[PDB]
Amino acid sequence: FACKTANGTAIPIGGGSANVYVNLAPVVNVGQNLVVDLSTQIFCHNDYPETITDYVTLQRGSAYGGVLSNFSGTVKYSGSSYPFPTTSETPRVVYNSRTDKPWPVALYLTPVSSAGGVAIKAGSLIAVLILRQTNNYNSDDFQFVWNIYANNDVVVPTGGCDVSARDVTVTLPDYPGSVPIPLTVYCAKSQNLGYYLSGTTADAGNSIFTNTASFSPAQGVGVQLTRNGTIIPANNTVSLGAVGTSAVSLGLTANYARTGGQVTAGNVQSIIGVTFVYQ
Amino acid sequence: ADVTITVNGKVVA
């Protein structure tokens, strides 16, 4: 039993714990969300298949780590699903050739939000997996640890639904023009969704986000969002109806709006949060 | 929040 990652990097085997860097592509699925498909990221083989057969199981106590430590879910191991953190030893995977074959493991998370996410930066710990290796000819029976680290920055969805982008940037035409905001949401199964806006406002109507531009800020103006011509105040939930597997636009447009006194020349910037809720 | 929107603009002189 000897393994390497997708880019060909050897995983030092047995003995001390190994730190294994993998690419992940987390997505919502029905009832659980994929965190990482390891089967495209870790490949193993047997250097003596004519005379030795290798067996590997995933041991009890394998679990998420780092920012995912408090989540539970499931592990798909060799085509079958088990609770994760693991509560029993899995069946074995057999390595019976010199040709590399996947380590057939995928990690899933049980949703706890509507459309939330947890950022995982490259270099961060994802999971701690405990493996047990045996064979078909002697008593060798050794257990060792693979610490699975992100090779790439991702946002792991924690809900039933996911968004087109977690960080959206738009630029208004020069005052007084407006700009549509490209932002959509979809769900793994049909869900009834709403959303609300968060941020600092300047006006009696709690609907004009303050201008926080750092350099040469314009005075007397902020940013106001509308959907189909209707102003959306902060902290007032907008309904999206039922969102299915195809993306639904939030329907948002950004506008300038006056906050009082003279409008003066300069830069404008506002940072506005969007939070989804089930309805 | 689940998404952050940054809106930039300008009032020209």
Numbering used by the authors:
A (entry chain A): 1 to 279
B (entry chain B): 1 to 13
Excerpt from the publication:
The adhesin FimH at the fimbrial tip specifically binds in a catch-bond mode to terminal α-D-linked mannoses of N-linked glycans of the receptor uroplakin 1a on urinary epithelial cells. FimH is a two-domain protein, composed of an N-terminal, mannoside-binding lectin domain (FimHL) and a C-terminal pilin domain (FimHP). FimHP possesses an incomplete immunoglobulin-like fold that is completed by insertion of an N-terminal donor strand of FimG, the subsequent subunit in pilus assembly. The two-domain architecture of FimH is a prerequisite for catch-bond formation because the interactions between FimHL and FimHP determine the conformational state and ligand-binding properties of FimHL.
To establish a stable, isolated FimH molecule with all properties of FimH in the tip fibrillum, we complemented FimHP with the donor-strand peptide of FimG (FimG residues 1−14; termed DsG). The experiments described in the following were performed with FimH from the faecal E. coli strain F18 (FimHF18), which is structurally identical to the most prevalent variants in uropathogenic infection, and FimH from the wild-type E. coli strain K12 (FimHK12), which differ in three amino acids in FimHL (K12→F18: Val27Ala, Asn70Ser, Ser78Asn). In the absence of ligands, FimH adopts the Afree state with associated FimHL and FimHP and an open conformation of the ligand-binding site, which is responsible for the 30-fold faster ligand-binding of full-length FimH as compared with the isolated FimHL domain. The results revealed equilibrium dissociation constants (Kd) of 3.6 and 9.9 μM for FimHK12·DsG and FimHF18·DsG, respectively. The rates of HM dissociation (koff) of 22 and 58 s−1 for FimHK12·DsG and FimHF18·DsG translate into dissociation half-lives of only 32 and 12 ms, respectively. Our biophysical data demonstrate that this mechanism is conserved between the K12 and the F18 E. coli strains.
